[PDB]
C-alpha cells in the first residue's frame, strides 16, 4: 500500500527533477543529454515496481494529495488516478521513450540547441503522464493542453522552415478545435452534474449523457487526427524525425481515444456516440489507407500508416471494447515508433533524402536497418503471435461477431488488407531492388548508441506484446466462439494484402509507359481534403475579417 | 486607507526635492516599497468587508485591483526612463508627478465608500491620462477624436451624475454599505429604463464595449508605453468595478436590459479576434485583443452569477498583467526599430534569445494556457454561460480558437522567422528590458499557486 | 520575355523529372528518357519559327495531365526536405559589433583581420561610388548587372554582405 | 551524420569524372578549362544533359539561368564550390 502508492508518485516528480536543474545552476554542462535519459532509465525501474504490485493486487488507487481550490461546493486538487491504465500505459511509454531517448542523443548531434531539445522532450513526457493519471477533467484538461503546446515547439523546432510554422499552427488550430468539446463536457458535468471528479461522474450514471459524450467525440476528432480534423497529423513530418517518433506516433496521438476509454461506464449505454465514433473511424480508417495506398513520402507515409491504425482504434471503441482497444495503443506504438527510428536510419545513410523512390538496395548495404523493418511491418500487418496481431485478430472478433452497422464492417476489412499493401510498397523500395540513392555513398550505421536504441525497441514488439497479454487480469468475456471464417477472416485477408500489393508492385517493373488516373491522384493527393480545406477556410476566416 | 495615500503623496517631494541623478531611483525604491505594505490589505473576512472610515474601505473584490495598481507604478517607471533620458530635467518630474497622482486617484477610487466620491475620482482619473497620452504622444496626425470623449460625457458621465443624484434623494444615501440594506426592487417603467441606461452606459464605454471601442485602438496608437500600461491594466478595469457594485440596485430590470449588451460582446469577441489577424501593428493588434478579453467580462457581470463574478475578477487581473506585459514586450522592439509595424522586423529569435523566451512565455498565458489564472477565470465564465444558455459555448469556443490563432501568429510572425537583412541595430537585450518582463510573468503564474486571493468576494 | 527558344529548355529538363519519378527504375528511366529525347529529336531539326512557336503550345497543354501526383523535389532546393531547415541557426555577420569584450577576448586573432576587411569596406567605398557613374545610363540603370574593379587593390562595388554571408552549415 | 566533408581537390574529378563517362566526348582531348561549345565541339542541348548529371551526382538542383553559362569545368567547379562555400 504505502510502498505501492509512495513509489508510484516518484516517477512524475522524479522525471521533473532534471527540468528543475535546467532553470537553475550551471554546475555541469555537456552532460545533461545523458542526464535525462538515465532518469527515464531509472524512472522505468520505478515504473516497473508498480507493475508488479498492481498485477498481483489490482490496487487501483486514487490519491488526492492536495486541497488546491474550493468553490461553494467544488474542490480541485493535484490528484492522480493510480489505476490499470496508468500502471500499464506508463511502462510502455517510458519503454518507447527510453528507446527514443538514446535515439535522439545521436541523430540531433547537428543541433547546438540539443540541450534545449531535451528541455522540451522531457517536458512533454511529464504532461502526458499527468494526463493519463489525472483524476479530474481540469487536471486532465491541463495535460490536454500541455501535449498541445509541447507539440507546438517540438513540431516547429526549426522555426525557419515555413512548413514548420504553417504545419505547427495547422495542428494547433485543429488541436484547439477539439478542446471545444472538452470545455463543453466540463460545463455539462458542472451544470447537470456538479463536479469534475470521476468518482461522482461514474457513480451518478447519467441517464441522458448525449451532450457530454458528443464533446468527447469531438475531442478525439482533432487531437487523435480522426477524419474531419485529420490533416495535421501527417503535417508533423516537416520537422525532426525523433520528435515525430514519440509525440505523433506513440504518446500524443493516443489522447483522443484515451478519454472515451477513461469514461467507459458512461459510453456503454448511449449508442448514438458509438455509431458515429464507429463510423468516424470507419471513414478515417480507410480514408487514411485509401489515401496511403499511393503516397510517396517516407515520413508522411508512416504518418498515414499510423493514421489508419489510429482510425481503427475508434472502431474498436465503437464496438464497445473498453480494455481490448487499450491494448492496440501499446502494441502499435512499439514498432511504428521503431519504424520512425528505422526511417531515421534510412535518412541518416541517405544524407537528407526522403523520397520513397530514392531508396533501394538496402538488404545488405543496410543489414541492421533491414533487420527490424520487417518485424514491425509483419507485426503491423498482423503476423501471428506478434505485437500487432493480438489486437488485430482480437479486435475484429466482436466487430464481425456482434451487433454492428452493415457499412461499418464494409471498410473494416477493405482497408485492413491495405494496411499491408503500403508496407510491401515500402519494404520494396526500402529494401528490395538495387540501390537508387545518389552517386556518393554515405552509408554507415556502425554506431553503438543507435544499436542500443534499436536493440531496446527491436525486442519489445517481438516479445513484450506477448508478455503484456499474460499478466493483465480478466475484465471481459472473450468471444472465443465464432464461425471459423470470421475467426480467421483476418487470417484469410491478411495474406491477400501482401500478395495483392505484390501483384501491383512487380508488374510496374516492366518497361511500359504510365497512364494517369483520377483515383490514382484522389488517393495520392490526400482526397483533396487538405489541398482544399487548407486554402479556402483560411481565406474565408481571413479574407472576410476586414469587413 | 490613509497609510497608503500619504506615502503615495510623499513621492511628490521625493520626485522633486531629490538630486538630479537620483530622481528615477528614489521613487523606484519607495514605490516598490509601498506595494509591499499594499499586501496588508488581504486581511479579508468571511462575512464582512473591511470598513475603515466613511471615506475609504476595501472588500475582497477591491484589494486585488488595488495591489495591481500599486504594483504597477514602479514597472511603469522602469520602461519610461529610456525614452525620457533625452528629456530635460524639469519635465521628467512633471510626467512622474502625474503618475503619482494617477495612482493616488486610482487607489482612492477602488477604496471609495461613497458612490459619488467614486464618481468624482472616476472623472479625475481621466485627467492625468489625457496629459500623458497627449503631452508625450507618439504621433502628430491630429485624428480629431475628441467627439468620442465628448460622446463619453454626453452618453456616459453626465447622465450618470443625474442618476446618482436621483438615487440619493429617493433612497436617501449613496453609501454602498447603506445600499446593501436599503436596496429597493426597481420595478419596470420608462423612467427606470432611462435610469438604468444612466448607471451603465458610463462604464460600458470605458471597458470598452464593441461598437463603442473606436477610441481604444487610436488611444494606444498614440499613448506612450508609460501611458498605455495603466490604460489597459487599470483604467479599463474601472467600469467593471462600478458595474459590479452599481448593479446591486438595478434588479430585476437588468433581467432583460442586458440582452443588447450581451449580444454586443458574444458576437463582439469573434469580430475583434478576426481583425487582429489582419492588423498591421503590434500595439493595435493588442488593442483589439484587449477588447476581446474585456468583452467576456461584460457578459459575466450582467448575468450576475456567483461563478461569473469569480471568473470576472481574474480576467481583469490576468489581462491587466497580460496586456501590460505585451505592450512592454512589444515596446522592447520599439526601442530598436522605432516602429509599430509588425512586419518591418522578423525572426528576432535569431538575435534576441531571452527576448523570445518572454514572447513565448507571455503568449502562452495570453491564450489562457492551463492552469494559469488567464484560464481559471476565462474557464470559470464559460461554464456560467451554460446555465444561462447552452448555445453560448459556440461563440466562446470560436473566440478561444481565434484568440489562440492570432496570439501565436504575432509570436510566429516576429520571432519564428528570418532576420531582416538590412536592419543593423539589434543590440543585445538590456538588463532593464528583461527585468521589466520578468516582474510581469512571474507573479502572474504565482497567483496560480494560490487562487484564493483573486477569486472575488463570492469566494 | 526570355524568348521561346530558351522556353524550350524549361520544359525539356522539367518534364524529365516528373518522368524520372514515374520511371523509378534505372533501366526504365534511361529507356523512357530515350523515348522522350527521341520525341524531342522529331522536331529538334524543325527550324520554322511559326511552327516552333506553334510546336510548344500542345507540349504545355500535353504535360499538364501527365504531371506527377507527387513530383520529386531535391532536398536543399525550395520545397525540399532541407528547405531552409538551418536558416534558424545561420547568424548575421554584422552582429559581430555588439559582441561583449570578454566574449571577444576568446578570438583576438580573427577580429584583428576583420578590421582590415572592414577597412577596405570603408576606404574603397568612395571610389566605388564613382566606379558606377561611368557605367550608369541615364533614365535609371538598364540592368542590375555589376562590373569588376578595373584596377588593383579595390573590389567590385556592392559586395560586402555576399562575401561575408554566413556559411551553409552553422553547426 | 558524423561529417560529410567536401574538398576542392576531391571534387575536381567529381565534376570531370562525370564527363569521363560521356559518349559524345573524347576523354583525352578534354581539359579542365576547355570550353564545351568550341573546345569540345558540343551544343547547348548537349550541355543540358551534362548539367543534369551533376544534380544526380551531388544532389542539389541548379537554376535554369545559371546552368547555361557553366560552359567551363572550372565554372562548374566554381558553382559547386561557391554554392556550398567550399574553398580548400
Amino acid at each position: 500500500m504505502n510502498m505501492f502508492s509512495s513509489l508510484s508518485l516518484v516517477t512524475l516528480l522524479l522525471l521533473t527533477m532534471p527540468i528543475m536543474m535546467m532553470s537553475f545552476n550551471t554546475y555541469k554542462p555537456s552532460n545533461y543529454p545523458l542526464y535525462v535519459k538515465t532518469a527515464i532509465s531509472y524512472a522505468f525501474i520505478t515504473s516497473m515496481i508498480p507493475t508488479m504490485m498492481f498485477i498481483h493486487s489490482g490496487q487501483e488507487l486514487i490519491i488526492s494529495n492536495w486541497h488546491w481550490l474550493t468553490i461553494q461546493t467544488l474542490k480541485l486538487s493535484l490528484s492522480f488516478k493510480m489505476d490499470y491504465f496508468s500502471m500499464m500505459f506508463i511502462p510502455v511509454a517510458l519503454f518507447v521513450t527510453w528507446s527514443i531517448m538514446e535515439f535522439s542523443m545521436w541523430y540531433m548531434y547537428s543541433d547546438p540547441n540539443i540541450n534545449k531539445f531535451f528541455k522540451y522532450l522531457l517536458l512533454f513526457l511529464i504532461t502526458m503522464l499527468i494526463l493519463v493519471t489525472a483524476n479530474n477533467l481540469f487536471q486532465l484538461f491541463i495535460g490536454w493542453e500541455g501535449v498541445g503546446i509541447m507539440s507546438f515547439l517540438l513540431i516547429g523546432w526549426w522555426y525557419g522552415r515555413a512548413d514548420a510554422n504553417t504545419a505547427a499552427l495547422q495542428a494547433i488550430l485543429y488541436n484547439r478545435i477539439g478542446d471545444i468539446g472538452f470545455i463543453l463536457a466540463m460545463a455539462w458535468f458542472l451544470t447537470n452534474l456538479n463536479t469534475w471528479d470521476l468518482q461522482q461522474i461514474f457513480m451518478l450514471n447519467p441517464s441522458d449523457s448525449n451532450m457530454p459524450l458528443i464533446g468527447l467525440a469531438l475531442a478525439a476528432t482533432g487531437k487523435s487526427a480522426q477524419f474531419g480534423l485529420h490533416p495535421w497529423l501527417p503535417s508533423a513530418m516537416e520537422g525532426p524525425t525523433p520528435v515525430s517518433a514519440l509525440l505523433h506516433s506513440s504518446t500524443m496521438v493516443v489522447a483522443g481515444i484515451f478519454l472515451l476509454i477513461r469514461f467507459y461506464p458512461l459510453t456503454e449505454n448511449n449508442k448514438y456516440i458509438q455509431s458515429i465514433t464507429l463510423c468516424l473511424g470507419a471513414i478515417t480508417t480507410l480514408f487514411t489507407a485509401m489515401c496511403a495506398l499511393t503516397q510517396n513520402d517516407i515520413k508522411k507515409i508512416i504518418a498515414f500508416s499510423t493514421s489508419s491504425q489510429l482510425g481503427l482504434m475508434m472502431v474498436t471503441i465503437g464496438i464497445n471494447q473498453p480494455y481490448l482497444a487499450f491494448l492496440h495503443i501499446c502494441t502499435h506504438a512499439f514498432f511504428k515508433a521503431m519504424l520512425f527510428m528505422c526511417s531515421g536510419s534510412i535518412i541518416h545513410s541517405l544524407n537528407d533524402e526522403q523520397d520513397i523512390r530514392k531508396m533501394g538496395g538496402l538488404f545488405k548495404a543496410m543489414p541492421f536497418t533491414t533487420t527490424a523493418l520487417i518485424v514491425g511491418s509483419l507485426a503491423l500487418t498482423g503476423m501471428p503471435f506478434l505485437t500487432g496481431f493480438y489486437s488485430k485478430d482480437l479486435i475484429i472478433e466482436a466487430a464481425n461477431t456482434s451487433y454492428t452497422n452493415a457499412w461499418a464492417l464494409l471498410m473494416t476489412l477493405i482497408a485492413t488488407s491495405f494496411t499491408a499493401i503500403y508496407s510491401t510498397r515500402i519494404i520494396f523500395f526500402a529494401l528490395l531492388g538495387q540501390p537508387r540513392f545518389p552517386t556518393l555513398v554515405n552509408i554507415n550505421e556502425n554506431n553503438p548508441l543507435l544499436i542500443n536504441s534499436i536493440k531496446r525497441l527491436l525486442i519489445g514488439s517481438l516479445f513484450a506484446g506477448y508478455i503484456i497479454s499474460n499478466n493483465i487480469p480478466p475484465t471481459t468475456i472473450p468471444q472465443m466462439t465464432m464461425p471459423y471464417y470470421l475467426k480467421t477472416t483476418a487470417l484469410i485477408v491478411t495474406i491477400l494484402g501482401f500478395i495483392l500489393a505484390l501483384e501491383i508492385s512487380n508488374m510496374t517493373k516492366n518497361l511500359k509507359y504510365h497512364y494517369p488516373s483520377n483515383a490514382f491522384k484522389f488517393s495520392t493527393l490526400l482526397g483533396y481534403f487538405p489541398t482544399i480545406m487548407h486554402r479556402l477556410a483560411p481565406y474565408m476566416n481571413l479574407s472576410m475579417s476586414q469587413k | 486607507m490613509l497609510k497608503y495615500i500619504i506615502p503615495t503623496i510623499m513621492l511628490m517631494p521625493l520626485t522633486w526635492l531629490s538630486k538630479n541623478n537620483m530622481i528615477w531611483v528614489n521613487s523606484t525604491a519607495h514605490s516598490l516599497l509601498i506595494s509591499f505594505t499594499s499586501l496588508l490589505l488581504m486581511n479579508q473576512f468571511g462575512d464582512n468587508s473591511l470598513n475603515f472610515s466613511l471615506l475609504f474601505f476595501s472588500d475582497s473584490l477591491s484589494t486585488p485591483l488595488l495591489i495591481l495598481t500599486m504594483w504597477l507604478l514602479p514597472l511603469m517607471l522602469m520602461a519610461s526612463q529610456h525614452h525620457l533620458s533625452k528629456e530635460n530635467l524639469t519635465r521628467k518630474k512633471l510626467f512622474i508627478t502625474m503618475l503619482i497622482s494617477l495612482q493616488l486617484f486610482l487607489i482612492m477610487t477602488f477604496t471609495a465608500m461613497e458612490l459619488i466620491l467614486f464618481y468624482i475620482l472616476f472623472e479625475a482619473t481621466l485627467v492625468p491620462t489625457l496629459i500623458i497620452i497627449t503631452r508625450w504622444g507618439n504621433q502628430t496626425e491630429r485624428l480629431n477624436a475628441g467627439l468620442y470623449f465628448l460622446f463619453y460625457t454626453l452618453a456616459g458621465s453626465l447622465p450618470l451624475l443625474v442618476a446618482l443624484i436621483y438615487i440619493q434623494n429617493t433612497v436617501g444615501s449613496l453609501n454602498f454599505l447603506m445600499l446593501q440594506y436599503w436596496v429597493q426592487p426597481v420595478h419596470n417603467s420608462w423612467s427606470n429604463v432611462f435610469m438604468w441606461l444612466a448607471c451603465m452606459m458610463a462604464f460600458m464605454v470605458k471597458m470598452p464595449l464593441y461598437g463603442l471601442h473606436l477610441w481604444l485602438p487610436k488611444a494606444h496608437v498614440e499613448a506612450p508605453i508609460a501611458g498605455s500600461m495603466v490604460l489597459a491594466a487599470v483604467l479599463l478595469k474601472l467600469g467593471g468595478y462600478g458595474m459590479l457594485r452599481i448593479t446591486l440596485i438595478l434588479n430585476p430590470m437588468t433581467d432583460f436590459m442586458a440582452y443588447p449588451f450581451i449580444m454586443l460582446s458574444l458576437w463582439g469577441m469573434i469580430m475583434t479576434s478576426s481583425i487582429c489577424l489582419r492588423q498591421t501593428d503590434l500595439k493595435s493588434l493588442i488593442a483589439y485583443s484587449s477588447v476581446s478579453h474585456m468583452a467576456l467580462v461584460i457578459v459575466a457581470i450582467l448575468i450576475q452569477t456567483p461563478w461569473s463574478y469569480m471568473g470576472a475578477t481574474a480576467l481583469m487581473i490576468a489581462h491587466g498583467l497580460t496586456s501590460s506585459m505585451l505592450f512592454c514586450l512589444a515596446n522592447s522592439n520599439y526601442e530598436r526599430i522605432h516602429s509599430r509595424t509588425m512586419i518591418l522586423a522578423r525572426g528576432l529569435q535569431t538575435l534576441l534569445p531571452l527576448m523570445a523566451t518572454w514572447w513565448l512565455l507571455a503568449s502562452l498565458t495570453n491564450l489562457a494556457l492551463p492552469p494559469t489564472i488567464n484560464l481559471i477565470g476565462e474557464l470559470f465564465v464559460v461554464m456560467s454561460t451554460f446555465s444561462w444558455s447552452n448555445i453560448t459555448i459556440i461563440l466562446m469556443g470560436v473566440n478561444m480558437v481565434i484568440t489562440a490563432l492570432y496570439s501565436l501568429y504575432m509570436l510566429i510572425m516576429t520571432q519564428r522567422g528570418k532576420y531582416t537583412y538590412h536592419i543593423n541595430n539589434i543590440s543585445p537585450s538590456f538588463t532593464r528590458e528583461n527585468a521589466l518582463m520578468s516582474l510581469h510573468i512571474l507573479p502572474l503564474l504565482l497567483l496560480t499557486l494560490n487562487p484564493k486571493i483573486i477569486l472575488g468576494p463570492l469566494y | 520575355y526570355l524568348t521561346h527558344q530558351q522556353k524550350v529548355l524549361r520544359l525539356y529538363k522539367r518534364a524529365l523529372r516528373h518522368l524520372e519519378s514515374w520511371c523509378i527504375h534505372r533501366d526504365k528511366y534511361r529507356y523512357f528518357a530515350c523515348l522522350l529525347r527521341a520525341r524531342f529529336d522529331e522536331h529538334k531539326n524543325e527550324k520554322d519559327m511559326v511552327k516552333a512557336t506553334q510546336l510548344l503550345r500542345e507540349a504545355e497543354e500535353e504535360f499538364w495531365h501527365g504531371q506527377h501526383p507527387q513530383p520529386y523535389i531535391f532536398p536543399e532546393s525550395p520545397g525540399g526536405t532541407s528547405y531552409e531547415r538551418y536558416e534558424c541557426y545561420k547568424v548575421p555577420e554584422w552582429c559581430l559589433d555588439d559582441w561583449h569584450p570578454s566574449e571577444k577576448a576568446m578570438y583576438p586573432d580573427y577580429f584583428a583581420k576583420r578590421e582590415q576587411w572592414k577597412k577596405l569596406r570603408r576606404e574603397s567605398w568612395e571610389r566605388e561610388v564613382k566606379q558606377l557613374q561611368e557605367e550608369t545610363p541615364v533614365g535609371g540603370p538598364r540592368t542590375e548587372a555589376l562590373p569588376p574593379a578595373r584596377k588593383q587593390g579595390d573590389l567590385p562595388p556592392l559586395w560586402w554582405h555576399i562575401v561575408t554571408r554566413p556559411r551553409e552549415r552553422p553547426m | 551524420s558524423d561529417a560529410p566533408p567536401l574538398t576542392l581537390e576531391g571534387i575536381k574529378d567529381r565534376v570531370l569524372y562525370v564527363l569521363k563517362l560521356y559518349d559524345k566526348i573524347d576523354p583525352e582531348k578534354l581539359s579542365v578549362n576547355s570550353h564545351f561549345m568550341k573546345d569540345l565541339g558540343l551544343d547547348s542541348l548537349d550541355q543540358v544533359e551534362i548539367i543534369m548529371a551533376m544534380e544526380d551526382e551531388f544532389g542539389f538542383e541548379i537554376p535554369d539561368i545559371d546552368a547555361e553559362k557553366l560552359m567551363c569545368p572550372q565554372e562548374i567547379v566554381d558553382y559547386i564550390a561557391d554554392k556550398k562555400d567550399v574553398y580548400e
Partner: peptide, 17 residues
C-alpha cells in the same frame, strides 16, 4: 569529432548580457 581539428568559427549573438 569525426575528423581531427576541422574546426569552423561560429557567429553568434552576444550572449554575455
Amino acid at each position: 569529432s569525426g575528423d581531427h581539428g576541422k574546426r569552423l568559427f561560429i557567429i553568434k549573438p552576444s550572449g554575455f548580457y
